[PDB]
């Protein structure tokens, strides 16, 4: 197995079992699930209530530093019945580790800004309001970044047909550069790649 297969390492997988055992121990009002990614990373499934609270515990302590906020992001899943998702991602400079914090939501239910905890979620929260539509309350500012001034669709979610709904073109009949509905010169062919037989037995979905 050795030559071409990535050699594993156990030690990293013993501790991040422990150190994550007990952050389901000391904040049970919030944390509803925790696990260990086979590559030695953690995922803490947290109710939407604690967001400002939990980080603040992760913000300072002598057993968990997690000062460096690296990557806020999102994922949007239909047939999860609460659409979107957040994933915070935080590096603790002293202890050399990554621990990610997953919090679900919907469009209508607001989520509360993390901005006083870290000042680097200032932009990453302005963006998401543009793309997916999640609305972060009590945010020192909320505006439009990455997108034009016209997009009323909030694209990256799964209902926006790739080409947006209005192509643009300039005409000299007056002055302006004006907007006429999208008319392509090629279909954007849809290929179909998904092959049968279920090559993965381990992930086998429940028998049903």
């Amino acid at each position: 197995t050795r030559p071409t297969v990535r050699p594993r390492n156990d030690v990293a997988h013993k501790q991040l079992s422990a150190f994550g055992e007990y952050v389901a121990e000391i904040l049970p009002k919030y944390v509803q699930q925790v696990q260990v990614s086979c590559f030695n990373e953690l995922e803490i499934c947290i109710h939407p209530d604690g967001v400002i609270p939990v980080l603040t515990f992760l913000r300072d302590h002598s057993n968990a530093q997690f000062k460096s906020l690296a990557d806020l992001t999102a994922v949007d899943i239909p047939t999860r019945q609460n659409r979107f998702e957040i994933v915070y991602n935080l590096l603790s400079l002293r202890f050399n580790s990554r621990i990610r914090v997953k919090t679900y939501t919907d469009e209508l239910t607001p989520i509360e800004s993390s901005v006083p905890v870290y000042k680097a979620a200032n932009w990453y929260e302005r963006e998401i309001w543009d793309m997916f539509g999640v609305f972060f309350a009590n945010h020192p500012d909320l505006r439009r970044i990455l997108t034009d001034y016209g997009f009323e669709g909030h694209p990256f979610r799964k209902d926006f047909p790739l080409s947006g709904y209005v192509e643009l073109r300039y005409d000299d009949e007056v002055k302006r550069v004006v907007a006429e509905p999208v008319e392509l010169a090629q279909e954007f062919r849809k290929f179909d790649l998904n092959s049968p037989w279920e090559a993965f037995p381990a992930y086998r979905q429940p028998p049903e």
Binding site: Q186, R189, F191
Partner: protein
């Protein structure tokens, strides 16, 4: 490990501080380089005198397209619909339909030359080894009605030089 840069202290003694007061007030520095390191113009210029001289390349270069044919010509392409299906940009467009004898070939083959992003993914998927990125930057015509190519633009553009192409692959094909 580490290093520390810009951590130093002035010496503070009258053997030194003249050396820093013979500098501010007499400009003993600042004429050191740009009184000199500028001139230093006496080196031979480096220019490729363009309309005539030209610069280096390598046998793996990418550029204008072609379709070869064997000795007495078969239009080497068999229309297996691959160089179409790995194409990131989706430039390629292919329509086969059985030729009279019953050997299959193409009808429409169109590489758009605006969309093509110059991968080197369509040189490397063709099993019968037809379609080949030429090493000629001949390009730049004046109308976008043009760069779209048909089949029977390509073949010529790939029979205009096959003395260029057929002698590169036999340098390069031993590596991959």
């Amino acid at each position: 490990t580490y290093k520390y840069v810009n951590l130093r202290e002035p010496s503070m003694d009258m053997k030194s501080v003249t050396d820093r007061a013979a500098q501010t007030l007499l400009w003993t520095e600042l004429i050191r380089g740009l009184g000199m390191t500028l001139s230093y113009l006496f080196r031979e210029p480096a220019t490729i005198n363009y309309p005539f001289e030209k610069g280096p390349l390598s046998p793996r270069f990418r550029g204008e397209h072609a379709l070869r044919r064997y000795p007495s010509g078969e239009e080497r392409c068999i229309a297996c619909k691959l160089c179409e299906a790995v194409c990131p940009a989706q430039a390629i467009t292919i329509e086969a339909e059985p030729r009279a004898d019953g050997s299959r070939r193409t009808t429409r083959y169109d590489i758009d030359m605006t969309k093509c992003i110059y991968c080197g993914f369509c040189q490397e998927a063709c099993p019968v080894d037809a379609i080949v990125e030429g090493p000629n930057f001949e390009f730049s015509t004046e109308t976008h009605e043009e760069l779209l190519y048909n089949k029977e633009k390509l073949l010529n553009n790939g029979d205009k030089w096959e003395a260029e192409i057929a002698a590169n692959i036999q340098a390069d094909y031993l590596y991959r």
